[PDB]
Design a protein around this ligand. Structure first.
Ligand code: CLA
Ligand code: CLA
Ligand code: CLA
Ligand code: CLA
Ligand code: CLA
Ligand code: CLA
Ligand SMILES: C=Cc1c(C)c2cc3nc(c4c5[nH]c(cc6nc(cc1[nH]2)C(C)=C6CC)c(C)c5C(=O)[C@@H]4C(=O)OC)[C@@H](CCC(=O)OC/C=C(\C)CCC[C@H](C)CCC[C@H](C)CCCC(C)C)[C@@H]3C
Ligand SMILES: CCCCCCCCCCCCCCCCCC(=O)OC[C@H](CO[C@@H]1O[C@H](CO)[C@H](O)[C@H](O)[C@H]1O)OC(=O)CCCCCCCCCCCCCCCCC
Ligand SMILES: CCCCCCCCCCCCCCCC(=O)OC[C@H](COP(=O)(O)OC[C@@H](O)CO)OC(=O)CCCCCCCCCCCCCCC
Ligand SMILES: CC1=C(/C=C/C(C)=C/C=C/C(C)=C/C=C/C=C(C)/C=C/C=C(C)/C=C/C2=C(C)CCCC2(C)C)C(C)(C)CCC1
Ligand SMILES: CC1=C(/C=C/C(C)=C/C=CC(/C)=C/C=C/C=C(C)/C=C/C=C(C)/C=C/C2=C(C)CCCC2(C)C)C(C)(C)CCC1
Ligand SMILES: [Fe+2]
Lengths: 32, 348, 31, 30, 76, 36, 27, 484, 187, 37, 96
């Protein structure tokens, strides 16, 4: 369903956000 | 083998390979432990995932039937099978693996392989202790869970009418087993069970109190607020003040240990003694030799309607447990008791 | 490979992943 | 009669507790 | 040998296991979804717990003919 | 050899474990054994 | 002599007799 | 010094005082056997072998005397109910006295071996250090055990020279000490076949003699010697403890499940004869026969043996007692006086109803009257406000066949209820309870008490075997590990 | 072991809440979760079911032979009830009690007729429907609701009785009990 | 229900309350990335 | 005996009233009292206080205060001896 698909998209986005920030700070310089 | 030329054999080669220091120690005991323990654990997981209890107990007890982790169980065979070993080649299964699963033979598989896995693990404790030249007090302590397993999963069903009254391997099935003992045996009133409960609770107390005492009587032994880095395993001094611990507990509790060796032997001694006492009590229950009643109190209650104790209340509760549990819990009894004969209270 | 560590790890893990796939499949069973 | 036995056993246990607390072997720093 | 963190951080390990692990997961999924789990382990499907003959739970009452008793009380 | 970070590996593994556990808890309310 | 009626005699008093837990596949 | 739990270690390296403490232990055990026999003779009542047999009176060693052929007493009675005019030396009291005399003689021998511990026999000829040749000692002992086992099986239990053993019918009605022919086929491994005992003892005695000769001849290998520590008596102790708890498990299982060596006339019925309808099926078969032969129901129930009816009572179940319900079953429910007769229940229209018998698990069981087809027709309600199966409304009467109540019909409520509650327990008996002041709760039988004691001893001896095997293997680190 | 796959993404056959059953010339909707019972409290019971949780919540039909032309000639609904009071269960208490409040002389059990209606068949034959609240001195489950639906078809009186607990009745058994009662089709 | 103009954002509304649970796990991720320094 | 359920149906509890060590108990307070804090001076007589379960509330309140102050005393002695203070934290679990 469209509701379940949008919920899954939002869930994947929020779950991947923080790890992406950490990965980007690891590969882009540091200070983490 | 002494100061004598014995010459090497295939036994010596096999011993050299088995006692080799590797990621998992096999040893001679591994040949018994690893397959038996592997098969017991895998059989229990297989039974909880796929194998039903529909033909043995009339129950759903598998994930594939919709049960969760707390509800799925490898259930005991039907009581009409008695104490049959239920080999897959046995007279019941006769080689058919699917019907062997349906008949409850997986319970016997798991129980027997678990018993031999316990034997193999104890032998592994002995073998590793002998290789490292340590005293075998770990195996001596592990004798008590083996005693519990033997008395509960073998001796009790062997004393009853069959494996059906053994515990089924699973969370809610163990809870069934526990409530069954309460209702049918008054197992709380049993002094051997009381000694077992005292041993288990005192051992938990000892573990907590000794860990706290060591962690709070530590020496400084290094700058830094993380004390866990102030210990080096290759050191020849105590890391906590036994004198200070003894002073603290003498002035708090009245008594305190002054002997570290005696303290650690006491930590060994309490749970092992408790589990052995509980095992003896379960052996008593295998023959229905229960501490069910106090006959003087029953006489006093029979000749005096105003005499009530919590013991009499518990007897009433046990009667309720048995009456409301039996029809669904023992299908082989074929008990269809009408509601009017069920013991109940007022408006509940 | 085929050392004792490899054998123990894979005897633990291969049926574990198989059973995990099995249980995940049976989460989506409608009677 | 039985109440006598129960009370005697309880007070004997408490007496053993009292003696084990206040007349224990003192731990020696040596 | 190798200290298992070197194993867990190696592209050779991950290119083997990105094939092996999902294949096993899909194998388990197919095992349940194709009914082979029911066929192998004898667990009844949700529609075949009861037959037209018996509308209650089965009861194995014979021991030395338990094989044919469970064959005739099972889902055919 | 260390080409992939161990923390990244552990984070992905934990994400898959949490997802599988969430699937298991979701399956408690749907399908078989959901009181429905 | 009438084995079925003695089996039915044992049935209600007791539901675990060998007379009824043996050869109960034809029933 | 020694901890209190290590005192007996002082005779580990003293063979003479090990012999002395063994002799003292044997004296104590023989004296217990004699004193227990004397106690059981003093308290035993042989008046009614049918309704007051020994297993109803708490007799524990009296069945073991009766099993091997001692059936008469110096009091003029026989255990089977006849009169003993020539009981001979080997009566119950004779065996008791012989055990007391044996205990005294073993006490004197123990004293002598304690004093004269320092015998040349205990010194080895070469090094002059105290040593026991444990392989050859085991060979001698195994040879003697084989001789004794073969003699017991070939002369005592065959009856060619000894008296035989107790043999009974499957339903424990007649019962007698008889000679037994050995069964050398597969039937010899039938555990309820009495012929298996002589065959086992003959074959195992021959094998024990041959194996003892082997151990007398052939010395152990060095590898097995070091791997089993055959130079240490504690290894022998661990293996012996292993053997004795194996045997304790075997005898406990044999006593609990029943066999040819645990007759019901000596030890009581088993729980499985109640749980499988053994005596109930036999009684119903004996009533069904001679009913097809035209006799009425008042007859063929008066032909039922009262002993057989007593075997069908759950109070004789060994699994209805308690851990602290102590003593004889007579002190529990009374001494049985007579069989009241079979109780047959019928409703107002005419169908026969049967009381659902109490299963072994249930301390209390609801009273239920079920018809021929398995439908519950009557009950004693817990809720008598809107009940619909009460005996009062169903109109249930009870008729008795073959006892002191015979042909007497009761249609009155609460007497139908009392006899239904008594029919819950099996056959109905009257019980004298003022003689021993019976409390009304069921006791266990000697079968159950034996099983309990020996299963508990078996687990404790499993722990002892673990402890001593560990002590033998880990002797060099018993006082601690090296500093290394 | 016939090979058939698991139903994945294939909807549910049930979730209608009821299972039909056609018996000896009658058809009715049983609750989907109820188990058949072999107990025969009346000696003319053709079908009996009971709830898997509570044995108080049961349902049963009786096909009792009748000599009358039809139920409307049997009397009024009150006259129908007065001659069928044995279904309630006889009071097996015979002691004088004035000490049970909400009750009367030497009585521990009472019944109240909550209502009555007359549902007709497709052409002319009515169904005597009933609704009784039975109460006891111990007040088991706050009383029991008995729903009775009866009629005569071909010289046989078919009577359905559904028994439910009152706490069951206000936790939700009322809807399924009324669904059972309003579907007793005997023709 | 949400207001009608905000109704299509109900799927992203239904995910938001778990983000505070995600923050402590993110702290553990960061600590693992600095190798629990 | 104490009317625990508040239904005028007392429960004996004590050795002199026919209990052994296993069955003997200090019976909880009457249900008619509920949570209403029944001390001796709130009773018309000691007999009424005993009938209604007053000893139970007395013992429970004093025991709660005593075990909380036992935990505090454990902290206090650890402080006076120069020890680390978390044995009281460990003892908080049986107190809870
Ligand atoms: C550590 C090894 C080990 C141990 C101790 C056990 C123990 C047991 N398993 Mg087994 N099991 C194992 C590994 C083991 N298993 C393996 C690796 C498999 C997987 C392939 C199985 C699969 C399995 C199944 C499927 C079953 C068992 C069962 C059993 C039980 C009875 C076994 C039996 O009766 O055979 C005893 C056999 C022997 C002692 C072998 C002795 C043979 C001698 C040495 C040679 C004589 C043979 C000779 C050729 C005959 C002709 C003689 C002629 C030449 C003169 C027992 C608890 C059953 C069970 O659990 O019941 C519920 C059961 O159904 N197991
Ligand atoms: C002509 C041949 C002949 C004959 C006819 C017999 C006949 C008999 N033998 Mg045998 N036997 C013979 C020669 C013969 N034997 C020879 C030559 C030997 C070698 C010396 C033996 C050695 C021997 C042994 C060692 C045993 C017998 C037993 C028996 C009986 C078997 C039936 C029975 O009651 O078993 C019932 C007994 C068992 C089934 C025991 C099986 C072993 C179990 C599994 C061990 C249980 C304990 C163990 C620690 C497991 C733990 C359980 C857990 C819950 C803790 C019967 C009297 C048995 C006996 O005396 O039983 C009363 C017995 O144990 N015999
Ligand atoms: C001349 C000596 C002698 C004789 C013939 C008797 C005779 C009797 N004694 Mg015994 N007794 C003796 C000396 C003797 N005793 C001594 C020395 C002691 C002290 C240890 C006792 C202690 C004693 C007790 C405690 C009891 C008796 C009892 C009995 C009676 C029944 C025996 C019975 O059931 O045993 C049955 C014996 C066994 C089943 C043991 C079998 C042997 C096992 C299986 C050996 C296993 C290990 C073996 C080495 C394996 C061999 C391997 C093989 C290949 C060869 C009987 C009147 C009983 C009774 O009722 O009297 C009160 C009883 O309770 N006796
Ligand atoms: C294998 C051992 C054993 C077996 C199975 C039997 C079995 C039998 N004996 Mg016997 N007897 C034995 C050895 C044995 N006895 C010995 C060694 C002696 C000498 C002391 C006696 C002396 C004896 C007498 C004098 C009598 C019996 C009687 C009985 C019967 C009743 C048993 C009973 O009430 O149990 C009671 C069992 C228990 C209460 C369970 C005990 C569990 C533990 C040990 C409790 C203690 C532990 C605890 C920490 C201690 C604190 C207790 C303290 C507060 C008091 C039964 C047939 C009676 C009978 O009917 O004779 C005709 C009887 O009067 N026997
Ligand atoms: C027949 C077998 C047997 C024999 C010959 C031995 C012999 C030995 N044991 Mg023992 N042991 C066995 C069985 C056996 N044990 C069993 C069954 C257990 C488990 C319960 C153990 C567990 C065990 C431990 C844990 C220890 C030994 C140790 C010892 C040594 C000194 C014991 C001592 O001085 O006790 C002195 C005992 C007392 C002063 C009083 C004991 C009183 C008991 C608790 C109750 C009374 C017993 C009763 C009267 C006898 C009737 C019961 C009977 C039927 C068994 C000695 C070599 C010790 C050792 O290795 O020393 C280095 C040691 O620490 N034993
Ligand atoms: C938890 C159980 C266990 C443990 C770990 C110990 C530990 C010990 N035993 Mg052993 N033992 C046990 C139970 C146990 N035993 C039992 C039940 C028996 C039978 C009475 C014995 C008999 C025995 C003797 C006679 C001796 C010891 C000795 C020893 C020591 C050396 C190790 C050894 O030989 O292992 C023993 C090996 C095993 C326990 C492994 C058994 C594995 C079997 C063969 C698998 C068979 C499976 C097969 C399919 C049957 C299943 C059929 C099914 C239907 C039931 C050590 C302290 C020896 C020693 O050196 O003492 C100083 C010694 O002489 N043991
Ligand atoms: C429920 C309680 C309980 C569990 C689960 C448990 C578990 C364990 N204890 C061990 C050890 C010990 N336990 C000890 C004392 C105690 N253990 C106790 C209570 C427990 N101990 C108690 C109370 C004591 C005090 C006396 C000691 C002294 C040791 C050890 O030395 C040892 C260790 O190293 O621990 C760190 C471990 C090694 C066992 C092994 O590999 O066997 C090998 C055999 C196997 C795996 C096969 C057994 C299969 C079983 C018997 C039957 C099948 C059961 C299913 C697989 C699961 C069913 C689950 C449902 C019932 C819910 C294992 C994790
Ligand atoms: C001193 C310490 C005594 C401890 C035991 C107290 C027994 C209580 C009592 O009075 O019983 C007393 C009772 C007898 O009691 C009386 O018996 C009379 C008939 O003789 C009447 O029946 C009376 O009604 C009855 O009260 O039994 C005993 O004499 C005890 C016998 C001891 C052995 C019994 C079997 C135990 C079996 C195994 C035990 C060990 C198991 C391994 C370890 C666990
Ligand atoms: C779930 C709720 C979480 C609460 C966990 C409580 C942790 C302590 C339990 C009681 C311990 C009893 C004394 C035992 C005791 O004193 O512990 C010893 C230890 C003391 O170590 P340190 O004093 O070096 O560390 C604590 C601080 O001083 C800074 O490191 O305590 C801890 O390790 C706390 C870390 C736990 C981190 C969360 C887990
Ligand atoms: C000198 C002499 C003589 C005399 C002798 C005699 C007289 C002997 C005896 C003896 C005896 C008379 C003995 C007896 C004994 C006993 C015993 C030895 C016992 C016991 C006990 C026990 C061990 C127990 C325990 C227990 C209890 C307590 C309870 C329960 C539990 C139990 C079981 C644990 C003569 C002249 C002949 C000769 C010369 C010399
Ligand atoms: C039966 C049998 C057998 C055996 C088998 C085996 C031995 C195998 C296996 C197997 C196995 C071995 C399986 C498995 C499974 C597993 C599983 C199923 C798992 C799990 C887990 C989970 C599901 C969870 C996780 C988690 C998460 C998610 C996160 C948090 C934490 C936790 C942990 C909770 C044979 C064939 C021989 C034959 C006979 C019988
Ligand atoms: Fe420590």
């Amino acid at each position: 369903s469209l509701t379940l698909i949008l919920q899954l998209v939002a869930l994947f986005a929020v779950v991947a956000a923080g790890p992406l920030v950490v990965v980007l700070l690891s590969v882009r310089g540091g200070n983490l | 083998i002494g100061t004598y030329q014995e010459k090497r054999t295939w036994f010596d080669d096999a011993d050299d390979w088995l006692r080799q220091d590797r990621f998992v120690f096999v040893g001679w005991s591994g040949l018994l432990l690893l397959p038996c323990a592997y098969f017991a654990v895998g059989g229990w997981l297989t039974g909880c995932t796929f194998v039903t209890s529909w033909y043995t107990h009339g129950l759903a007890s598998s994930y594939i039937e919709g049960c969760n982790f707390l509800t799925a169980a490898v259930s005991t065979p039907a009581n009409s099978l008695g104490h049959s070993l239920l080999f897959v080649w046995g007279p019941e299964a006769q080689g058919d693996l699917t019907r062997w699963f349906q008949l409850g033979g997986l319970w016997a598989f798991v129980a027997l392989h678990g018993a031999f896995g316990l034997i193999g693990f104890m032998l592994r404790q002995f073998e590793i202790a002998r290789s490292v030249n340590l005293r075998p007090y770990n195996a001596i302590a592990f004798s008590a869970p083996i005693a519990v397993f033997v008395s509960v999963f073998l001796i009790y069903p062997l004393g009853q009418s069959g494996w059906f009254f053994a515990p089924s391997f699973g969370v809610a099935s163990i809870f069934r087993f526990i409530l069954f003992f309460q209702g049918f045996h008054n197992w709380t009133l049993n002094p051997f069970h009381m000694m077992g409960v005292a041993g288990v609770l005192g051992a938990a107390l000892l573990c907590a109190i000794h860990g706290a005492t060591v962690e709070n009587t530590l020496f400084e032994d290094g700058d830094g607020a993380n004390t866990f880095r102030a210990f080096n395993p290759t050191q020849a001094e105590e890391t906590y003040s036994m004198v200070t611990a003894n002073r603290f507990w003498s002035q708090i509790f009245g008594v305190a240990f002054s002997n570290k060796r005696w303290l650690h032997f006491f930590m060994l001694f309490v749970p092992v003694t408790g589990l052995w006492m509980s095992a003896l009590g379960v052996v008593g229950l295998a023959l229905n030799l229960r501490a069910y009643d106090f006959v003087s109190q029953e006489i006093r209650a029979a000749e005096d309607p105003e005499f009530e104790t919590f013991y009499t209340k518990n007897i009433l509760l046990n009667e309720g447990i048995r009456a409301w549990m039996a029809a669904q819990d023992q299908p082989h009894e074929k008990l269809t008791l009408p509601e009017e004969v069920l013991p109940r209270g007022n408006a509940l | 490979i085929f050392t004792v560590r490899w054998l123990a790890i894979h005897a633990i893990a291969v049926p574990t992943i198989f059973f995990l796939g099995a249980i995940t499949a049976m989460q989506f069973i409608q009677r | 009669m039985e109440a006598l036995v129960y009370t005697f056993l309880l007070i004997g246990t408490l007496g053993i507790i009292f003696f084990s607390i206040f007349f224990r072997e003192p731990p020696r720093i040596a | 040998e190798r200290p298992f963190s070197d194993i867990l951080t190696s592209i050779r390990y991950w290119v083997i296991h990105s094939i092996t692990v999902p294949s096993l997961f899909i194998a388990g999924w197919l095992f349940v979804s194709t009914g082979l789990a029911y066929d192998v382990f004898g667990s009844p499907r949700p529609n075949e717990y009861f037959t037209e003959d018996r509308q209650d739970a089965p009861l194995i009452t014979d021991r030395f003919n338990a094989l044919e008793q469970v064959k005739k009380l099972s889902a055919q | 050899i260390g080409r992939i970070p161990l923390w990244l590996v552990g984070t992905v593994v934990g994400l898959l474990a949490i997802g599988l556990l969430a699937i298991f808890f979701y399956g408690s309310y749907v399908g078989l054994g959901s009181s429905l | 002599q009438r084995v079925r009626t003695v089996l039915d005699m044992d049935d209600p008093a007791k539901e675990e007799t060998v007379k009824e837990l043996r050869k109960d596949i034809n029933n | 010094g020694l901890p209190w739990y290590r005192v007996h270690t002082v005779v580990i390296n003293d063979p003479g005082r090990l012999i002395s403490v063994h002799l003292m232990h044997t004296a104590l055990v023989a004296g217990w056997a004699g004193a227990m026999t004397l106690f059981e003779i003093a308290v035993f009542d042989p008046s009614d072998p049918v309704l007051n047999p020994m297993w109803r009176q708490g007799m524990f060693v009296l069945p073991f005397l009766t099993r091997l052929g001692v059936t008469q007493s110096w009091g003029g009675w026989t255990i089977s109910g006849e009169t003993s005019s020539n009981p001979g030396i080997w009566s119950y009291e004779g065996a008791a006295a012989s055990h007391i005399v044996l205990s005294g003689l073993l006490f004197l021998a123990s004293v002598w071996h304690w004093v004269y511990w320092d015998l040349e026999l205990f010194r080895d000829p070469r090094t002059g250090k105290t040593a026991l040749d444990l392989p050859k000692i085991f060979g001698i002992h195994l040879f003697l055990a084989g001789l004794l086992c073969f003699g017991f099986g070939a002369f005592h239990v065959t009856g060619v020279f000894g008296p035989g053993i107790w043999v009974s019918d499957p339903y424990g009605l007649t019962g007698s000490v008889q000679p037994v022919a050995p069964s050398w086929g597969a039937e010899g491994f039938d555990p309820y076949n009495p012929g298996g005992v002589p065959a086992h003892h003959i074959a195992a005695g021959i094998l024990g003699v041959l194996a003892g000769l082997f151990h007398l001849c052939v010395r152990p290998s060095i590898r097995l010697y070091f791997g089993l520590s055959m130079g240490s008596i504690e290894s022998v102790l661990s293996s012996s403890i292993a053997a004795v708890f194996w045997a304790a498990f075997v005898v406990a299982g044999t006593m609990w499940y029943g066999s040819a060596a645990t007759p019901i006339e000596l030890f009581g019925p088993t729980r499985y004869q109640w749980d499988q309808g053994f005596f109930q099926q036999e009684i119903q078969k004996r009533v069904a026969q001679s009913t097809s032969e035209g006799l009425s129901v008042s007859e063929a129930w008066a032909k039922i043996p009262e002993k057989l009816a007593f075997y069908d009572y759950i109070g004789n179940n060994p699994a209805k007692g308690g851990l602290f319900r102590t003593g004889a079953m007579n002190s529990g429910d009374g001494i049985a006086v007579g069989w009241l007769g079979h109780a047959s229940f019928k409703d107002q229209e005419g169908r026969e109803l049967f009381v659902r018998r109490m299963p072994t698990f249930f301390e209390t069981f609801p009273v239920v009257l079920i018809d021929k087809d398995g439908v519950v027709r009557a009950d004693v309600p817990f809720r008598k406000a809107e009940s619909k199966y009460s005996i009062e409304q169903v109109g249930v009467s009870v008729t008795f066949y073959g006892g002191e109540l015979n042909g007497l019909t009761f249609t009155d409520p609460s007497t139908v209820k009392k006899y239904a509650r008594k029919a819950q327990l099996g056959e109905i008996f009257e019980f004298d309870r003022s003689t021993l002041q019976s409390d009304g709760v069921f006791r266990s039988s000697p079968r159950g008490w034996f099983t309990f004691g020996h299963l508990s001893f078996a687990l404790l001896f499993f722990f002892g075997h673990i402890w001593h095997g560990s002590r033998t293997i880990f002797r060099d680190v018993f006082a601690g590990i090296d500093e290394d | 072991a016939y090979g058939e796959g698991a139903n994945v993404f294939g909807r549910v056959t049930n979730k209608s809440g009821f299972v039909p059953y056609a018996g000896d010339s009658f058809a009715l909707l049983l609750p989907s979760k109820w188990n058949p019972s072999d107990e025969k409290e009346v000696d003319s019971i053709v079908l009996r079911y009971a709830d898997n949780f509570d044995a108080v919540n049961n349902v049963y039909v009786i096909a009792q032979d009748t000599d009358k032309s039809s139920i409307q000639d049997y009397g009024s609904p009150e006259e129908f009830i007065s001659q069928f009071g044995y279904l309630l269960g006889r009071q097996a208490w015979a002691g004088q009690t004035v000490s049970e409040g909400g009750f009367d002389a030497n009585k521990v059990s009472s019944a109240a007729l909550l209502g009555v209606a007359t549902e007709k068949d497709k052409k002319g034959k009515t169904y005597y429907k009933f609704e009784i609240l039975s109460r006891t001195a111990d007040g088991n489950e706050g009383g029991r609701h008995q729903l009775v639906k009866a009629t005569v078809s071909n010289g046989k009186l078919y009577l359905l009785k559904v028994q439910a607990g009152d706490k069951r009745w206000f936790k939700g058994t009322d809807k399924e009990c009324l669904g059972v009662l309003d579907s007793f089709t005997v023709v | 229900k949400l207001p009608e103009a905000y109704a299509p954002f109900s799927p992203i509304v239904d995910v938001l309350p778990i983000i505070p649970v995600l923050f402590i796990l993110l702290a553990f991720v960061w600590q693992a990335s600095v190798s629990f320094r | 005996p104490v009317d625990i359920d508040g239904i005028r149906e007392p429960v004996s509890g004590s050795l002199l009233y026919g209990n052994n060590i296993i069955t003997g108990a200090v019976v909880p307070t009457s249900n008619a009292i509920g949570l209403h804090f029944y001390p001796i001076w709130e009773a018309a007589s000691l007999d009424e206080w005993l009938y209604n379960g007053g000893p139970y509330q007395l013992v429970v309140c004093h025991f709660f205060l005593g075990v909380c102050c036992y935990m505090g005393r454990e902290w206090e002695l650890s402080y006076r001896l120069g020890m680390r203070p978390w044995i009281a934290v460990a003892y908080s679990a049986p107190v809870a």
